[PDB]
């Protein structure tokens, strides 16, 4: 596949393309200070202003392989790296103990 | 085939002053709580004699009379019919069937006081007229047809 690994990877600069209207429209909704006439003004926000402004369709993978499973928070890499990284020494502090 | 285990009985009861009774908290402990077990380990022995007139170590000791068998029920081959093995055995066998099956009839009584439905059978062995005494006399006269099979074909 070639038209797959370079069309959802570009979500780094398109999901936060605006990035300044996306925070000026999503905090005071969590505030009840909006008036009873003002249910509508905060809802001209992000959808027909072209709809790459939400983030429900992004997924975390590996870098050099691209495996979504086995991905953790302490790496940008996946389950087929940990056996072959710190023995060549690509990961700090990963030491066997008990 | 070697027996490698070492028999380590640990008997020291904090208040009760028994000889053979102390460590028995194993089927009174129903995989649960010890504070639930406090009126039924010794508090039920403080509940046996409360309708009786003795010490609760009197009636407990004499379970080695009539609910303890004489012969053993293990099966053996020669070339034919599978022969069981009747023999005079050391107390670790016959009195092992004089303590744990005496308490095992506790569910078909189902009365008030959880503490009483475990130890409401122990005082029936003064004459020996309870539940575990019926099966012990079944053993002896289901051992007539076997008692000569100890050396010859055994």
């Amino acid at each position: 596949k070639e038209s797959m690994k370079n069309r959802e990877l570009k979500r780094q600069l398109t999901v936060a393309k605006y990035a300044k209207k996306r925070a000026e429209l999503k905090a005071i909704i969590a505030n009840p200070n909006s008036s009873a006439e003002e249910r509508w003004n905060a809802q001209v926000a992000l959808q027909k202003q072209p709809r790459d402004a939400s983030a429900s369709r992004l997924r975390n993978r590996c870098r050099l392989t691209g495996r979504p499973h086995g991905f953790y928070r302490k790496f940008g890499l996946s389950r087929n790296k940990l056996r072959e990284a710190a023995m060549r020494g690509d990961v700090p502090g990963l030491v066997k103990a008990s | 085939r070697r027996r490698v285990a070492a028999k380590r009985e640990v008997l020291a009861d904090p208040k009760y002053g028994s000889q053979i009774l102390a460590k028995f908290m194993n089927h009174v402990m129903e995989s649960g709580k010890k504070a639930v077990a406090e009126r039924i380990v010794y508090g039920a022995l403080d509940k046996v004699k409360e309708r009786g007139k003795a010490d609760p170590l009197e009636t407990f000791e004499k379970a080695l009379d009539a609910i303890a068998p004489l012969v053993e029920v293990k099966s053996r081959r020669v070339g034919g019919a599978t022969y069981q093995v009747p023999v005079e055995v050391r107390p670790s066998r016959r009195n092992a069937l004089a303590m744990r099956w005496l308490v095992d009839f506790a569910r078909k009584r189902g009365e008030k006081s959880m503490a009483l439905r475990l130890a409401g059978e122990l005082l029936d062995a003064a004459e020996g007229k309870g539940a575990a005494v019926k099966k012990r006399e079944d053993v002896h006269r289901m051992a007539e047809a076997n008692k000569a099979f100890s050396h010859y074909r055994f």
């Binding site: 249910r39 509508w40 809802q43 001209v44 959808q47 027909k48 | -």
Partner: protein, 80 residues
């Protein structure tokens, strides 16, 4: 969840052939390009067809509807 924390439905781009089409008579079905797209609670009695890719279903809407999705006119798994 799915309570009435969201009271109204003010959605602007799902609207501009719906709220404008009040003065115009009802002679054409309003076609929909989603399995999600909903419309007002004060327009009650329009026609929306379940959008997935092969053929359309009978959709009958009366005055007493308040609750949930359009997933009942055609089913989720329609027993093929």
């Amino acid at each position: 969840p799915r309570s009435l924390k969201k009271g109204p439905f003010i959605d602007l781009h799902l609207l501009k052939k719906v709220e404008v089409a009040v003065e115009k008579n009802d002679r054409k079905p309003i076609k929909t390009w989603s399995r999600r797209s909903m419309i007002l609670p004060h327009m009650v009695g329009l026609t929306i067809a379940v959008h997935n890719g092969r053929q359309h279903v009978p959709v009958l809407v009366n005055e007493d509807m308040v609750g949930h999705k359009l997933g009942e006119f055609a089913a989720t798994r329609t027993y093929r």
